[PDB]
Amino acid sequence: SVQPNFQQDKFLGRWFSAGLASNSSWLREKKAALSMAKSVVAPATDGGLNLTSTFLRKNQCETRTMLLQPAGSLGSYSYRSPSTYSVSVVETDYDQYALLYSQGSKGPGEDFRMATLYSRTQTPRAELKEKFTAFCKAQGFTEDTIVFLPQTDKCMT
Numbered sequence: 001s002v003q004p005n006f007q008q009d010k011f012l013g014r015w016f017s018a019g020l021a022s023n024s025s026w027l028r029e030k031k032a033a034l035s036m037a038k039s040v041v042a043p044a045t046d047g048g049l050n051l052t053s054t055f056l057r058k059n060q061c062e063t064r065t066m067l068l069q070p071a072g073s074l075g076s077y078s079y080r081s082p083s084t085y086s087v088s089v090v091e092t093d094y095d096q097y098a099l100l101y102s103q104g105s106k107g108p109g110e111d112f113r114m115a116t117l118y119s120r121t122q123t124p125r126a127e128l129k130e131k132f133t134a135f136c137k138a139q140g141f142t143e144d145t146i147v148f149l150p151q152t153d154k155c156m157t
Ligand SMILES: CCCCCCCC/C=C\CCCCCCCC(=O)O
Pocket: 027, 030, 031, 034, 053, 055, 064, 065, 066, 114
């Protein structure tokens, strides 16, 4: 589902990529080879969101931006990889955590599913990890595919 009464303005700003579950071994392995710093959520010129991710790969800071186009329900977006993917904010309290769920909506990407835990703080919090694990299990992810991403304190400004 999608967060009821979703308020995009309260969702903006700095988030940390704390947890990930995916059914793609290729994707999990790619993510495991890097360390996340922060992500920034900001309104895009198209009415959706820009998600700008900063991370460390081989001790170099890198940034990548993804355009999340509005998908016609608040909290629901579409991403086209330069397959198309639905991206939903399933649950958030805005000031501590957000649970996102993505899956392919067109093309061979339809095989793809991913849950993401974002946190307003970088430091792990057991209750948030439990919430994420419960969500991933409910969405059919196996335990072994529910992982908590290595963080970095670099790249932060
Ligand atoms: C601009 C191309 C996509 C970059 C995505 C940026 C957010 C994640 C940062 C780098 C992780 C690299 C993993 C390769 C793409 C995975 C995309 C994803 O499923 O989140």
